[PDB]
Amino acid sequence: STGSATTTPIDSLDDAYITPVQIGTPAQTLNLDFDTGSSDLWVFSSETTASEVDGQTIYTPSKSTTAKLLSGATWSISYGDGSSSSGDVYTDTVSVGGLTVTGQAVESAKKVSSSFTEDSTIDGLLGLAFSTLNTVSPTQQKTFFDNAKASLDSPVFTADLGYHAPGTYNFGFIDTTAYTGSITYTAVSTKQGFWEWTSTGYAVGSGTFKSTSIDGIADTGTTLLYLPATVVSAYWAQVSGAKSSSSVGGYVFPCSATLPSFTFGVGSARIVIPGDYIDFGPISTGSSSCFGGIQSSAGIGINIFGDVALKAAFVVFNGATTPTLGFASK
Numbered sequence: 001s002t003g004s005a006t007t008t009p010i011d012s013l014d015d016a017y018i019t020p021v022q023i024g025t026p027a028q029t030l031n032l033d034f035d036t037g038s039s040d041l042w043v044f045s046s047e048t049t050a051s052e053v054d055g056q057t058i059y060t061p062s063k064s065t066t067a068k069l070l071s072g073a074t075w076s077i078s079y080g081d082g083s084s085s086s087g088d089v090y091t092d093t094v095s096v097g098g099l100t101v102t103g104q105a106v107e108s109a110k111k112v113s114s115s116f117t118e119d120s121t122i123d124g125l126l127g128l129a130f131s132t133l134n135t136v137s138p139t140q141q142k143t144f145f146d147n148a149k150a151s152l153d154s155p156v157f158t159a160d161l162g163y164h165a166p167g168t169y170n171f172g173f174i175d176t177t178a179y180t181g182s183i184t185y186t187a188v189s190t191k192q193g194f195w196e197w198t199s200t201g202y203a204v205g206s207g208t209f210k211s212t213s214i215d216g217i218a219d220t221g222t223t224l225l226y227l228p229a230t231v232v233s234a235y236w237a238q239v240s241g242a243k244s245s246s247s248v249g250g251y252v253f254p255c256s257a258t259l260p261s262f263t264f265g266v267g268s269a270r271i272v273i274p275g276d277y278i279d280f281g282p283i284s285t286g287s288s289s290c291f292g293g294i295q296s297s298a299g300i301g302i303n304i305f306g307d308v309a310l311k312a313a314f315v316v317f318n319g320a321t322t323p324t325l326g327f328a329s330k
Contacts, residue, residue, distance in 0.1 A: 001151045002172035003099025007034065007161065010121040013280055014307060015223050017161060018122060019169055022095040023106055024064030030057050030123035034169055035221030036159070036195055036317065037304075039133035039143050040077050041094070042085055042107035043124035044116075052112050055120030061108065067092040075107045075135045080222065080300065085112040089136055094144060096126075099171050101148050105134075105141035125221070128157065128317065133193035145171070145319060155319040159220055160330065161311035163277055179314035179328035184269035188323045192302075194219070195317060197325050199305075200267060202227075204235050205260030209270070216303030218310060218317070218325055224280070225262075225273070226297035226304040235262055235294050242292070248283050251292035255282060262294060264309060266327040273312040 007019040018031035023043065030043055044053060046060040061067035067090045076086035087110035094104040109124070116122070127134070131142045149155045152172030160178050161167040168178070189196045194217040201211040214227065232251065236242040238260050242253035253259070259275030278293035293308040316326030 001099055001148070002153055002170070003095075003097035003148075004168060004170045005097030006166050007169050008166045009162065009164065010119070012164070014161075014164060014311065016122060017167070017220070017307070019096070019126070021126060023059055024061070024092050025066040026064075027095070028057075028059055028064065030059060031121065032124045032126040033122050033221060034126050034128055034159075035219070036128040037217060037219035037221045038077065038079065038125065039127040039129045039131055039193065040075060040107050040135055041105065041124070041126045041144055042075065042077070042087070042109055044112070045087070045108040047087060048109045049111055052117045054117050057123045059106065059108065059124075061090045061092065061106075064092055066102075067106075070105065070136075070139075070141075073105075073136050073139060073141075075137070077135045080304075081115065083113045083115045085109045085116060087111065089141070096144065096171065097169070099148055099152075101144055104144055104147055105136060107136065128220070129195065130190050130193045132190070145317075148172075149319055157317050157319070159310060159315045159317065161220065161307055163274075163311050167311070174316060179330045181329050183314070183316055183326040183328040184266045185316070185318070185324045185326045186266055188325055190323060192217075194302075195323070195325055200265030202231055202265065203263040203270075204238050205275075207238075209263065209265065211265070214264075214303055216297075216305050218305050218315060220307065220310060222304045222306030223308070224304075224306050225294045225308040226300055226306065227294060228303065229296045229298045232294055232296045235260070236292065244296075248289070248291070250295045252283060252289045253292055255288045255290040257290075264305070269327065271309070271313045271327055271329060273309060277308055277312060
């Protein structure tokens with residue numbers, strides 16, 4: 001089997017991407033944030049505290065003839081941005097782009113933190129990291145990809161995120177029309193439960209490539225590119241007026257600037273992020289200070305190849321017995 005679903009930016013900045021997901025019988029379609037940095041499929045639901053729902057579409061398990069409460073199971077998750085959610089668990093039928101998994105754990109939110117409430121466009125998350133990170137207790141549950149893998153034509157999914165435009169998540173096949181050149185594969189460590197790999201270096205604009213190993217995670221659920229402070233300083237030093245602002249929380253730059261591109265290495269290959277992809281717009285409405293799309297990871301503990309980086313590539317998440325990642329230009 002295979003599946004193919006379109007993923008759409010939630011706003012004009014590509015702050016996140018939503019993909020429609022069918023849950024239950026008859027289908028209830030929710031727009032979920034596919035997140036290769038976490039491993040829980042959780043949804044706003046009929047059980048979510050009413051004051052914490054503000055425009056989202058909810059899953060109502062009582063209207064699904066295939067929903068079954070997973071007795072005794074609870075979940076609770078916190079994300080790198082400080083947001084969180086928790087609740088109980090059902091199993092139900094879940095389909096993405098024509099690919100169907102029965103008995104998928106659907107984690108029903110009883111509580112969500114304010115940033116989730118405040119974002120009416122995201123009805124939940126669909127985790128695509130490794131199932132060892134799944135938070136369900138006392139019986140850990142598998143991700144949608146893990147459950148589907150055996151049935152897929154090939155044990156892979158691909159992320160093809162658009163810049164200011166829709167893109168595609170495919171399951172079980174590699175669309176050879178969706179990228180240019182060849183796909184360069186690189187080793188993955190699953191020791192932290194992430195799609196963790198080592199970039200071979202970087203370049204700023206037309207500058208010379210610096211060969212240096214940068215360990216990080218391919219995380220569709222993170223908006224920006226978070227890299228070591230040395231790398232980020234080298235980038236922003238090429239933008240007149242750019243500075244790190246403790247009050248804003250990162251590098252800002254004059255909105256009148258033209259940003260240089262940023263290149264990252266994948267083995268001997270190179271992925272070029274155009275400068276425009278690094279512009280996240282005014283820090284507040286009407287400001288002439290703009291927020292940068294490349295930020296320091298120094299306070300995180302891990303480097304994160306988020307959407308800014310991933311949307312410059314066609315990305316293969318290869319879930320073979322030894323997982324690997326593939327990157328191609330497009």
